[PDB]
Design a protein around this nucleic acid. Structure first.
Lengths: 260, 185, 130
RNA sequence: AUCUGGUUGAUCCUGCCAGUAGUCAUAUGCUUGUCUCAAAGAUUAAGCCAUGCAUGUCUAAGUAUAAGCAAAUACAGUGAAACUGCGAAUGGCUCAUUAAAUCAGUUAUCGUUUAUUUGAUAGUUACAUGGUAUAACUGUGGUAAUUCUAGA
RNA sequence: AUUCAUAAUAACUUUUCGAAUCGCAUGGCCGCUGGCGAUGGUUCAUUCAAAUUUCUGCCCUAUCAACUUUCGAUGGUAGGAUAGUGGCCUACCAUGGUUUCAACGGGUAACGGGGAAUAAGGGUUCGAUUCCGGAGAGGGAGCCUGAGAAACGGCUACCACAUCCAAGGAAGGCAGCAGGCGCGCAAAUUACCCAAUCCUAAUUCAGGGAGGUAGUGACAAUAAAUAACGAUACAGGUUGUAUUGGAAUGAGUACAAUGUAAAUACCUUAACGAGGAACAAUUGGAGGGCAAGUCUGGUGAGCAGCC
């Protein structure tokens, strides 16, 4: 290739979008933006495929150009704008708010939230450094840069951000006994508490997690996102609390309830 | 281009063509159940072959292996639903004892004979293809349709036919008209 | 026999000022029902003007007797006229078919014009003199 | 999964052959009623090509005195041409070359560039400057000829 | 883990940037002051990316046993060039580097991989071709514009072909779509459309042979018609063999609606539509391997994978 690529063939798209095989030759390619391509969710997929508010790609554009949809409090009109983990989406008519968060299968859920919670989002701290003239700043996973952080904040900590003004109001240290959300790999979507951490100089650190049914699993540190103290999430959790079930357990519950 | 459509072949051919003893056994089934081809027999033995392959594999796994529990129960459940396996023989070792006649016995073509309605397996086939039989509300016209145990209560003549309550057919109507017209002569 | 119409999976959609739903029809002893008849009966049950009702995509069950499709009803005739595709409006007679030339002819005109620089009122005069 | 036939007048071996079944493996012959689904100038010649088409683009928001159309004395609706900005480096086709090369899994940049998107970020040096300027346009022309273009 | 981030001092530059721009609205205080947006701009971070790079892995050949160093082969110091590391190139200096654990040379009717066929197990054969990566636009070389190209639906030259002409000159690249010639055992229409999937632009609106629809199509795959049932006569224990009677239906055709961007077809349906139901199923065989003729007429070229 002689430059950047503009098209994404279907089948090459991320599997968690749950596109069907046969309806066309192509898939929507996400624009450059706050989140990585492989793990974003384009607005067209949200409005059309999940909420069913639109029948066509054409009807999605008719919605956006009326300026009904805003993301993190700002109006967006690009059909392929890449929303991602922890973003807040608001539809003013209908009076609905959603937060993007994973099901335990590792798919973006349709999760409704109150008008109160729509004020803020969480952010994972990716680096902390001095800028020009010696002013310190922090960088979050969604690419915000915030001036004059509290001197205690360090990498891997988590930070609470007011969506108006865009300023830090609280933070939590990375430490044992915190709640965590897993955001990558085979265990994507599980929740548990930190048991301990393994140092590997020049390598990748590993973290040991325990869930409330005291199953245990291990993941690379890059996949771990802190979300609160033990038993006290800073945000409303999706239905099912991130508890993984075996295939035998799922079959029993369905035919018990759905099968009466 | 669009993603490929998948497809697969549904029958297997016997590897020795002129094994005389086999030719006799096949012809008795076709005469008994009113089949039109050997292929209709090959299709069934092909399905039965794969069921045994899967079951025989699972029996190498220990009991209380989670995979043997999950998939073994599914297979048994699925055969009981169509009535191929008795709910008394509801155990995996008995799956290896099934034979071809257990499946042919469940085809819609033969059930419509055992219930009455028709009066030979040859008469039964004609009615199905000519759209006279319904299962529930739906008209069905495929003889090889496997009748699940629930459906047997609901096999009856279609509402939109003679024998089911509709108008007489095209030939009956023609005869009445000519005779009526002649009776006016 | 009397026709029965039912609606299912009803969604209200303020973002496009419409309601959208499945249309399910039982019609024993007739081939099917015309879209024009369905538009009338839906109009009176949802208390709407007929021009605000749109209906598409039907198929009928094997062996007959039943059909299924999709239906829309807009909050006004004006809003329908802006959100609806033009081809559907033509079916209802709410719009007039446009009369462009065939696709091959338009393309050939374009390629002829690319060879002219400027408006071409000049050049014509020069050729007339030759 | 575990076949059958062929070497003395009469047998048993070695050995190979013939038969049998499959092929998202091609071709070809005879024959052909219904529903669903669907590959298709790779193999020989990365050989040669008539004709048509396949890349352009405007919003309330860069530049309007068309001698365009349609009806607030600087202008104000709609809008051809042309200047300006952006794109044409994506897509589509083919398999000639190429044997530690390409490629696959796994690493590194404390060894470097990056239109665009997103977030931060410049008190420090006239009530509005000039053509060292020109297109479209008006008007005079050249050549058998092209998406040729000269002088004013 | 740093001669990191960042800050300070003395200077340097041929002097980088630090808004002479556009829409809508018309408020506050007694000619001053004010709102919501658009487009630009320096540096840092982020996103879409690029370049280089570590480890291990490839088909046949010894009728290829020694190979590289002039003309960079292996290494050291300094410089040049590059976005940047490095014999990448130059000057000087040293004499190194690979190999029977197969180097070097030759062959491939060789693009790599995910994969495909063949099911006891182990294997054998194949992968031009729907996804990922590389390369090329008749053959070699060079370069402009740009963030990005050594671009070919951009330019310049040479080599090989080849078009028009007033003979002075001018113009060229289907291994894009459709189509033609040639080749061969071997492969479709110079059709309709942006309605869907998506992409580009100053953009809801324009454009797209990308893509979709129909035509051709026994490559391969799924379902499945060509007849069912009585009477009579005869024979047999309810089953065979021949004159005779009512019923049933789609193949096909067609009003209509549905389908579709508009259509064709499928699904549904008024009317019509079977008695030699001529509305008539073929392709290979009958010594053995290998299912099935001591039949009957002719003859003394034919048959046969094998006997």
């Amino acid at each position: 290739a002689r430059g950047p690529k503009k098209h994404l063939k279907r089948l090459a798209a991320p599997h968690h979008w749950l596109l069907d095989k046969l309806s066309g030759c192509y898939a929507p390619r996400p624009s450059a933006g706050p989140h990585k391509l492989r793990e974003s969710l384009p607005l067209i997929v949200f409005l059309r495929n999940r909420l069913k508010y639109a029948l066509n790609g054409r009807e999605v554009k008719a919605i956006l150009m009326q300026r009904h949809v805003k993301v993190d409090g700002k109006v967006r009109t690009d059909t392929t704008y890449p929303a991602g983990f922890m973003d807040v989406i608001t539809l003013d008519a209908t009076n609905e708010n959603f937060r993007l968060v994973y099901d335990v299968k590792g798919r973006f859920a349709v999760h409704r939230i109150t008008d109160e919670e729509a004020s803020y989002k969480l952010g994972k701290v990716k680096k902390v450094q001095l800028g020009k003239k010696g002013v310190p700043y922090v960088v979050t996973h969604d690419g915000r840069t915030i001036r004059y952080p509290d001197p205690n904040i360090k990498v891997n900590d988590t930070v609470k951000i007011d969506l108006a003004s865009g300023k830090i109001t609280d933070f939590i240290k990375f430490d044992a006994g915190k709640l965590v959300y897993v955001t990558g790999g085979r265990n994507l979507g599980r929740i548990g508490t930190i048991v301990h951490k393994e140092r590997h100089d020049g390598g990748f650190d590993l973290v040991h997690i325990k869930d409330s049914l005291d199953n245990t699993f291990v993941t690379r540190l890059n996949n771990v996102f802190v979300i609160g103290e033990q038993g006290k999430p800073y945000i409303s959790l999706p239905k099912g609390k991130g508890i993984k079930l075996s295939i035998a357990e799922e079959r029993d519950r369905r035919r018990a309830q759905q099968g009466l | 281009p669009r993603a490929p459509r998948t497809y697969s072949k549904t029958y297997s051919t016997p590897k020795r063509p002129y094994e005389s003893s086999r030719l006799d056994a096949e012809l008795k089934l076709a005469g008994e159940f009113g089949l039109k081809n050997k292929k209709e027999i090959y299709r069934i033995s092909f399905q039965l072959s794969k069921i045994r392959r899967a079951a025989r594999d699972l029996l190498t796994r220990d009991e209380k292996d989670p995979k043997r529990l999950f998939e073994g129960n599914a297979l048994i459940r699925r055969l009981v639903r169509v009535g191929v396996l008795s709910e008394d023989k509801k155990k995996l070792d008995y799956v290896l004892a099934l034979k071809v006649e257990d499946f042919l016995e469940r085809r819609l073509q033969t059930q419509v004979y055992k219930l009455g309605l028709a009066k030979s397996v040859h008469h039964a086939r004609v009615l199905i293809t000519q759209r006279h039989i319904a299962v529930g509300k739906q008209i069905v016209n495929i003889p090889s349709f496997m009748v699940r145990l629930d459906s047997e209560k609901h096999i009856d003549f279609a509402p939109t036919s003679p024998f089911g309550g509709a108008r007489p057919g095209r030939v009956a109507r023609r005869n009445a008209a000519r005779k009526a017209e002649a009776s006016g002569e | 026999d009397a026709v029965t119409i039912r609606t299912r999976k009803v969604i209200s959609n303020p973002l496009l000022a419409r309601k959208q739903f499945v249309v399910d029809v039982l019609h024993p002893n007739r081939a099917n029902v015309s879209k024009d008849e369905l538009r009338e009966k839906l109009a009176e049950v949802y208390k709407a003007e007929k021009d605000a009702v749109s209906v598409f995509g039907f198929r009928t069950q094997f062996g007959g007797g039943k059909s299924v499709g999709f239906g829309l009803v807009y909050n006004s005739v004006a809003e329908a006229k802006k959100f609806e595709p033009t081809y559907r409006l033509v079916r209802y007679g709410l719009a007039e078919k446009v009369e462009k030339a065939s696709r091959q002819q338009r393309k050939q005109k374009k390629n002829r014009d690319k060879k002219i620089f400027g408006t071409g009122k000049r050049l014509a005069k020069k050729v007339a003199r030759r």
